[PDB]
Amino acid sequence: LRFLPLELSEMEAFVNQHKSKSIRRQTVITTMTTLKKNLADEDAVSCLVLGTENKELLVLDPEAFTILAKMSLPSVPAFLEASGQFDVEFRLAAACRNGSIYILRRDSKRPKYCIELGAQPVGLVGVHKVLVVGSNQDSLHGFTYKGKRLWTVQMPAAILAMNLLEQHSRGLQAVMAALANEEVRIYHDKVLLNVIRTPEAVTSLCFGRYGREDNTLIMTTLGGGLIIKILKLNVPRKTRLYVDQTLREREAGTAMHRTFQADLYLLRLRAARAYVQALESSLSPVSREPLKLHAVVQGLGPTFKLTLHLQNTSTARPILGLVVCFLYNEVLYALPRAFFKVPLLVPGLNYPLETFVKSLSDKGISDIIKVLVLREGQSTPLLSAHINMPMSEGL
Amino acid sequence: IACIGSNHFYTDQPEVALRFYRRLLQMGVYNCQLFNNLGLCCFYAQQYDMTLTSFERALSLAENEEEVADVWYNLGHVAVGTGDTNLAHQCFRLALVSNNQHAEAYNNLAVLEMRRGHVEQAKALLQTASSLAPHMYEPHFNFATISDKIGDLQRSYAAAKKSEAAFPDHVDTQHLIKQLEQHFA
Amino acid sequence: LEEYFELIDHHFELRINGEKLEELLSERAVQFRAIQRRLLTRFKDKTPAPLQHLDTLLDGTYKQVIALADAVEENQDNLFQSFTRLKSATHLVILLIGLWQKLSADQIAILEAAFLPLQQDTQELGWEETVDAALSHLLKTCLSKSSKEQALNLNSQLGIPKDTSQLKKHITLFCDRLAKGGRLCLS
Amino acid sequence: ILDENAIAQVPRPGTSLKGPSPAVRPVTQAGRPITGFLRPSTQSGRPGTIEQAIK
Amino acid sequence: LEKQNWLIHLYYIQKDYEACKAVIKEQLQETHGLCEYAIYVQALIFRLEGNIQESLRLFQMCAFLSPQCADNLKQVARSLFLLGKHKAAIEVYNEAAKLNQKDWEICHNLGVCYIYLKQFDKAQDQLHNALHLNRHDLTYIMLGKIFLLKGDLDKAIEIYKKAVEFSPENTELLTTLGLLYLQLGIYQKAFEHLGNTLTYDPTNYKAILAAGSMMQTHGDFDVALTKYKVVACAVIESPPLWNNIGMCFFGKKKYVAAISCLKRANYLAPLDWKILYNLGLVHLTMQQYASAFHFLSAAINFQPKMGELYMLLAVALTNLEDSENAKRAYEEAVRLDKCNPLVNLNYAVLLYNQGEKRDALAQYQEMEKKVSSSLEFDPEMVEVAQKL
Amino acid sequence: MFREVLPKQGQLYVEDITTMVLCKPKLLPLKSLTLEKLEKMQQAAQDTIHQQ
């Protein structure tokens, strides 16, 4: 609907002609690998490794276009989707977003999925006999088709795109690598070559030497440069105190039981007493009729910021008519608005309702301040809170 | 004596700590802290005869509103160790009534609420606890757990990550974070 | 619904200007503190040394801080005036909605609670977020039947927005879904 | 915060002032388990900024 | 509109999220929007971080750009489902399905949503569909969860067996099927599947726990103790592990070293009735009778509809100079117990020791109606018989 | 002369279920002598201020 030259607002928004729509398609096919030597027929090259960004590792049939098996071993997005499963009997290799590398072979063959990494393996690299992958945490990645990481770590930093030059099934020539800080890291079969400080690197390059160069001569840069350079347990212990205590318990268990039950009865009595007294004075900042309030004081100096965090705690029911009233000592603290309505409390949101307390006493005097939250048709506070105002540190 | 006694209590040796604190009792020390400590030690060292009278002397000796709240908190711990979650409910609510900014009381009362079934009450109380004391790990972990139980994996992640920030060598927090990061892909 | 939105936008422009002024005052205060610590270090030291015009940088930063403080004061006063005028406007709008449809006393009380939440803005709760949460909830539990919209558009938070378009959309949608025959409730 | 006197800014862990896990022992800060015998010289951790110390 | 679509995918694919974001921002600044893949990948990156709000917003924008795309609607419904809203997630998955009727993800997600909505018929049918389109492990797990929540393991054993039949390397499936075998009488195939799990993962805590439990059940406490030593350091503070270790140490007559572990586990979970019951039982065996009552009363207050709890509380009350409370506790137990003759035999012993000998015969007949392995409950069976 | 028989087998957990954890019992830390003296000297000034 929009031309390349044109922009949204009058070129992708001038669809008063048609404004038609359509349906979906396939995705960005972020791989390509094809079992060759049948391209003269182009149909018995049935491998079409399309690792799409809809996470499917789709393989449409080559020259038949059936895609009978569209199964993907990715289980997630593919970091190293291609250049992976070259078995000579065509066992495809796929890389998971999680970093776990799968071994999904031809027509989604079932093979153990190797998790051969600690970090994310986003560095898969072909080696001319096996499928080279790069360890995420600055570790060289070496591996064969049966899980076993053949190689030990060989890279100081995070590589980005490996390759390999020319040698046989039993063989490997110069197998280079990228770096995160982009240093060329040519690796000899028997030794390392270099570590540079140049601009950035790629996902894929190619040793396209016409005249027998070992080097790739392919360049990728933030700036888009196209390079061609060719350089038993902890079970506790018990002392005499424990055995003496257990002996006392074994010889005087009845008295302990009786006196602990008496103490528990008295404790229930006193706890019920204090709970009833609190209900009377309505001093609980947590108390059908769901609410929860607590007051925080901030700041030294003669002026303190007093923020009441109030919250409706119910499934879905707002509280319309409520109001807050402060009780202070009018000779020590100067509250501008000692009484104010509260907004409609939506269930689940903490409303901070703040005020500015100010100490008036020239001498340091710390006095309590009460807060009462109550309905507008009732006179008994719905709930209350207390705050010990700190010292003034005045002038 | 106090330091070695505390260390003896917390490394699952409450009888040696009870001895170390009975020593201070023998030397005329008469506080609210000492008697609450003696109560914790007596209960956890399994001496049920001298347990609650120590908490009573503590509540008697408390010259504050935070000391009273801590004694009621510990009495609620005694109660929940005895069972009878209603008594512990009352003790935690009284700890709140005494000291409004008592985050452990909020967390434990929310645990008991979710034990009863009231999920929204528990969520609000755990939010209050984690707002008062961010350095604690239990309110964050419990909030993340209940969220993940109902859903809301965003809140579960934001809470489990703060749990890992509070107690970075936890175990259940790690499993929670792994499950969450797995759900995100 | 159109001469009412301009007052809301004026209020929110003043709020955004205040937040910008405050985040600038933060940087000015940090500069002043850094230069003050440098000067204190030069003071505690025994050996004499050129001040290297550190006092001049301190004076400049102090002038900047005083200017920004006066600017924040004037912005607070302007914001308060705008809030009072907005309170009058929303009073009139609730009146005209309670007359434009035969609204009883209950729904008028619900509207007065949702639209008239506070008499002073603060650096943690303002009129916009509060009335937006209240209206989103009132449309969520009463005036909506599609869950897709209930979860996509009708959500409520208490953080200062970056634009007033959601609030205005919700107010127009409220008047609309009242026009079709909707009615308010609580449960 | 506003007074710096320590020579080393990032000294070796184990030579500067600036056990049971939080699953057993209650805590006061990110670490620093609760102590016995409060004394008026206890610092028990330190804030990072004036704002954090105030709030 | 999408000049550099691939580079962004390759940067996001390699878990960069830093250069990918810069390229996204550059592309969007150049194209003034309408890219549909600088917004999509950016929202996926947001979702990878904790944030699931900006991800939802940007997936909304991607759906607005391509109104007739099923994947964008799927992603928006998924961003909803990552929050608590499942009804809206269902109503967006429905639209995502009326544009594509051939994918398993919509059906699996509708199943897991209807699961959170307690609609089990629709969830069950949707997950059956999700299997028929493309069988996945998570669909099997959710179906097993449905059949466990709704009904019985008789419906879950078939599903879990069919699931482990293919792709048998998933530890979750093996371990859950082994657990469900434990839940029933079979102890052999449970051991088979738990060992199958342990071959793959030797240090699997969720499987080591159940294996050690099964071992403890059939004696041989040292093998379970070694199993627990395997995982002790991985989970150093976990109430179930220490409870099982305390029962190990209580098996081989190490009563003090069992009280230690059980009290440690009780401190780390004061609301767990199993540890309270175990503490009560061990303090009964240790003949303390003052603590036993306390812990058994706690475990009663935590799970009151049990028969053995009241039996042990009555045995603690018989030695605490309180026989009337023991009478009423035994009455509670015999009313609340169905298939344990130990309660009846102990109440018969209490009665016969009270000098009655009348209702002791009633409790003996109740026991003999209930009935068989314990060595010491056999003798008292015959001694209270012949002496009555 | 019959002794009540006790079961020799306890209850064993067969799965770890995520349960909400409670905060832990709090040993009230003791005070020094200087701290008590400072608090009492701080409150005595308040008392004399109120008693004038």
Enter the tokens of residue A33: 């690998």
- Beta partners for residue B100, in sequence order: none
The answer to whether the beta carbons of residues A125 and A154 sit under 8 Å apart is no
The answer to whether the beta carbons of residues E136 and E167 sit under 8 Å apart is no
Nearest-by-Cβ selection for F29 from D24, D35, D40: D35
For chains A and D, count residue pairs whose Cβ atoms are closer than 8 Å. 4
Interface test with chain C among A339, A342, A346, by most C beta carbons within 10 Å: A346
Q: Helix, strand or coil for residue A357?
A: strand
Q: How far apart are CA E79 and CA E61, in angstroms?
A: 13
> Tokens 């309590």 appear where?
A368
Q: How far apart are CA E20 and CA B13, in angstroms?
A: 55
Write out E209-254 in H/E/C secondary structure.
Answer: HHHHHHHHHCCCHHHHHHHHHHHCCCCCCCHHHHHHHHHHHHHCCC
Q: How far apart are CA D35 and CA D30, in angstroms?
A: 14
**Of the candidates C107, C98, C170, C115, which has an alpha carbon nearest to the alpha carbon of residue C139?**
C170
Enter the tokens of residue B49: 């005869």
Q: How far apart are CA E45 and CA E23, in angstroms?
A: 13
For chains D and E, count residue pairs whose Cβ atoms are closer than 8 Å. 7
Q: Helix, strand or coil for residue A222?
A: coil
CA distance A296 to chain E (A): 28
- Which residues have CB under 8 Å from E168's CB, separation 6+? E174, E196
Q: How far apart are CA A132 and CA A143, in angstroms?
A: 6
Q: How far apart are CA B73 and CA F24, in angstroms?
A: 10
| Length of chain D in terms of residues written | 55
Domain boundaries defined on chain A: 27-231, 232-287, 288-395
The answer to whether the beta carbons of residues E74 and E93 sit under 8 Å apart is yes
Enter the tokens of residue B12: 């699952």
Q: How far is CA C84 from CA A335, C183, E64, in A?
A: 21, 29, 39
Q: How far is CA A267 from CA A272, B55, B75, B76, D22, in A?
A: 8, 9, 9, 10, 29
- Beta partners for residue A94, in sequence order: A102
**Of the candidates A52, A53, A81, which has an alpha carbon nearest to the alpha carbon of residue A67?**
A52
Residue A269 near chain E (CB below 8 Å): no
Contacts of E267 in chain D (CB under 8 A): 24
**D27 secondary structure, DSSP code:** B
**E286 secondary structure, DSSP code:** T
- Chain F residue at shortest CA distance from A365: F46
Domain boundaries defined on chain C: 1-187
Q: How far apart are CA B1 and CA E275, in angstroms?
A: 32
Q: How many CA atoms lie within 13 A of A14 on its CB side?
A: 8
The answer to whether the beta carbons of residues A29 and A52 sit under 8 Å apart is yes
Q: How far apart are CA B181 and CA E82, in angstroms?
A: 12
Q: How far apart are CA B73 and CA E18, in angstroms?
A: 48
- Amino acid sitting at position C4: Y
Q: How many C-beta atoms surround the C-beta of residue A356 within 10 A?
A: 14
Farthest-apart Cα atoms in chain B, separation: 64
> Tokens 């580079």 appear where?
E7
- Long-range CB contact pairs, E198-207, < 8 A, 24+: E200/E169, E200/E171, E201/E171, E202/E230, E203/E230, E203/E231, E203/E234, E204/E171, E204/E175, E205/E231, E205/E234, E205/E235, E205/F16, E206/E175, E206/F15, E206/F16, E207/E171, E207/E175, E207/E178
Q: How many C-beta atoms surround the C-beta of residue A134 within 10 A?
A: 28
Helices (H), B99-171: 103-116, 119-132, 138-150, 153-166
Q: How far apart are CA A186 and CA A201, in angstroms?
A: 13
- Amino acid sitting at position C120: Q
Technique employed here was: cryo-EM
Q: How far apart are CA F3 and CA A5, in angstroms?
A: 98
The answer to whether the beta carbons of residues A322 and A371 sit under 8 Å apart is no
Q: How far apart are CA E145 and CA E118, in angstroms?
A: 12
The answer to whether the beta carbons of residues B92 and B112 sit under 8 Å apart is yes
Question: What is the DSSP code string of F7-37?
Answer: -S------S----PPPP-------B-HHHHH
Q: How far is CA A232 from CA B147, E229, E237, in A?
A: 38, 8, 16
Nearest-by-Cβ selection for D36 from B5, B12, B167: B5
**Of the candidates E68, D42, E302, which has an alpha carbon nearest to the alpha carbon of residue A23?**
E68
**Of the candidates A88, A74, A70, which has an alpha carbon nearest to the alpha carbon of residue A170?**
A88
Q: How many C-beta atoms surround the C-beta of residue E259 within 10 A?
A: 24
Q: How far is CA A111 from CA A104, A115, A120, A123, A145, in A?
A: 6, 12, 21, 21, 10
**Of the candidates E317, E260, E305, which has an alpha carbon nearest to the alpha carbon of residue A261?**
E317
- Amino acid sitting at position B135: H
Q: How far apart are CA B149 and CA B154, in angstroms?
A: 12
**A152 secondary structure, DSSP code:** P
The answer to whether the beta carbons of residues E341 and E331 sit under 8 Å apart is no
Touching D (3+ Cβ pairs <8 A), the chains are A, B, E, F
Strands A368-375 and A383-388: antiparallel
> Tokens 């409220």 appear where?
C174
Q: How far apart are CA C108 and CA A24, in angstroms?
A: 49
**Of the candidates E112, E118, E168, which has an alpha carbon nearest to the alpha carbon of residue E141?**
E112
**Of the candidates A194, A192, A193, A228, which has an alpha carbon nearest to the alpha carbon of residue A213?**
A228
Residue F21 near chain B (CB below 8 Å): yes
**Which segments of chain A are extended strands (E)?**
50-51, 57-58, 94-95, 101-102, 125-126, 131-132, 292-298, 303-311, 322-327, 339-341, 350-358, 368-375, 383-388
Q: Helix, strand or coil for residue B159?
A: helix
Q: How far apart are CA E346 and CA A23, in angstroms?
A: 76
Helices (H), chain A: 240-251, 253-281
> Tokens 């069972």 appear where?
B83
CA distance E385 to chain D (A): 51
Contacts of A366 in chain F (CB under 8 A): 46
Q: How far apart are CA B138 and CA B162, in angstroms?
A: 10
Nearest-by-Cβ selection for B83 from E84, E260, E297: E297
- Which residues have CB under 8 Å from E2's CB, separation 6+? E27, E31, E35, E36, E37, E38
Q: How far apart are CA A57 and CA A71, in angstroms?
A: 7
Q: How many C-beta atoms surround the C-beta of residue E169 within 10 A?
A: 13
Nearest-by-Cβ selection for E315 from F6, F12, F22: F6
Q: Which residues of C138-170 are buried (b: 16+ CB within 10 A; e: fewer)?
A: bbbbbbbeebbebbbbbbbebeebeebebbbeb
> Tokens 């839940």 appear where?
E183
CA distance D1 to chain E (A): 32
**Of the candidates E257, C123, D51, which has an alpha carbon nearest to the alpha carbon of residue A355?**
C123
- As a dihedral over the C-alpha atoms of residue B163, residue A119, residue E231, residue B156, rounded to 10 degrees, the angle is 30
- Chain C residue at shortest CA distance from E80: C151
- Residues of A near C (CB-CB distance < 8 A)? 307, 316-318, 320-321, 340, 343-344, 346, 349-354
Q: After which residues is chain F broken (C to N over 2.5 A)?
A: none
Q: Helix, strand or coil for residue E10?
A: helix
**Of the candidates B66, C103, B69, which has an alpha carbon nearest to the alpha carbon of residue A388?**
B66
Touching F (3+ Cβ pairs <8 A), the chains are A, B, D, E
**Cα-flanking dihedrals φ and ψ of residue E278, to 5°?**
-65, -40
**Cα-flanking dihedrals φ and ψ of residue D33, to 5°?**
-60, 155
Question: What is the DSSP code string of A191-220?
Answer: SB----------S------SS--SS-----
**Cα-flanking dihedrals φ and ψ of residue E157, to 5°?**
-65, -40
CA distance B28 to chain A (A): 23
- Chain B residue at shortest CA distance from D25: B10
**A29 secondary structure, DSSP code:** B
